[PDB]
Amino acid sequence: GSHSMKYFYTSVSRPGRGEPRFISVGYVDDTQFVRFDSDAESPREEPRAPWVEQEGPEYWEEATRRAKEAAQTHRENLRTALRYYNQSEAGSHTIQKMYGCDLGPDGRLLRGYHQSAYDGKDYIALNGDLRSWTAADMAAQNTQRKWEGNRYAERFRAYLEGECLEWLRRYLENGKETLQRADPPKTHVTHHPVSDHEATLRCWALGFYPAEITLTWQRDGEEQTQDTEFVETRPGGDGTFQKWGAVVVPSGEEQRYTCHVQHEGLPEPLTLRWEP
């Protein structure tokens, strides 16, 4: 039911401290499976998921090769950027690049991604049509023009519909019981008095996958945004995710508030009340 594979690239220049640091990670949906760090004691593509370890040496050698090539080219892009924005070589700068493909249920390509930022701001991104590019500024227009000149969008499109999908399906089959799972969130409501006239209601959602989830509070059956605090979805450290949503309530109205939780692993959405 719609899956995704994405690669994340981060190159940071560090003047005086040698070559720029290169860190790239691979994800299937919300599960990391590979990792390459130029500052590792023996830089190479490493497995971070149990279901990818079964790949033979050829896979790790090829992956290491591609990762290293990406590192070199990124290092060249740093310099090219210094020249574009007319910046000093004594300052630190960062290039980030995410790309990947979305496997639709019909087995065909659903979505394509190839976007990159410089110093935390959009630089250049592949458009939804997977044929044209969008440049964020003047400097990126050079990259856009020269990428159009050598038909890169098409070349990346060949990968999107080729190796990307094939290997995505492969990963999906090999890690079926962990990637194609829908673990529902363990939920409960807690009560934390703020004073004598108020109290915080906290709705918990623990150990669910994937990270996609929805938590809302309602007063008398009507959604409430006032006096609510929803924290950013956080990882469990074991491959799961957590999230809680709190609401400040007048003492005595606790039973008029309900928590609503929507998740893929839930047969039907949950309506929770504080059970002392």
Binding site: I23, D119, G120, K121, H192, E232, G236, G237
Partner: protein, 99 residues
């Protein structure tokens, strides 16, 4: 552009005094990637603290997960200390079992 990091110090499982558990400090939405994170028990750096591989989200902001094994009680205090260029000195967030 620079962004201030968000910190969430929490446990993997609902904490029970005397029961082994996992302490997590989740730092997100920061930039650049240069950052220092420490897990502290009673103000002192814990023994074995590790972190996840650097990654980022849609808005390009980075996020990291630092973690260690801890067994919570009533007398001990756990916290997470973060240092970043956007922070005026180190910021320390105590672990609250209610959060």
């Amino acid at each position: 552009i620079q962004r201030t990091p968000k910190i969430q110090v929490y446990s993997r499982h609902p904490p029970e005094n005397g029961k082994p558990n996992f302490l997590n400090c989740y730092v997100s939405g920061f930039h650049p990637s240069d950052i220092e994170v420490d897990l502290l028990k009673n103000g002192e750096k814990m023994g074995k603290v590790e972190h996840s591989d650097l990654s980022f989200s849609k808005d390009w902001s980075f996020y990291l997960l630092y973690y260690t094994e801890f067994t919570p009680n009533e007398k001990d205090e756990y916290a997470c200390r973060v240092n970043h260029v956007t922070l005026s000195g180190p910021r320390t967030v105590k672990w609250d079992r209610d959060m």
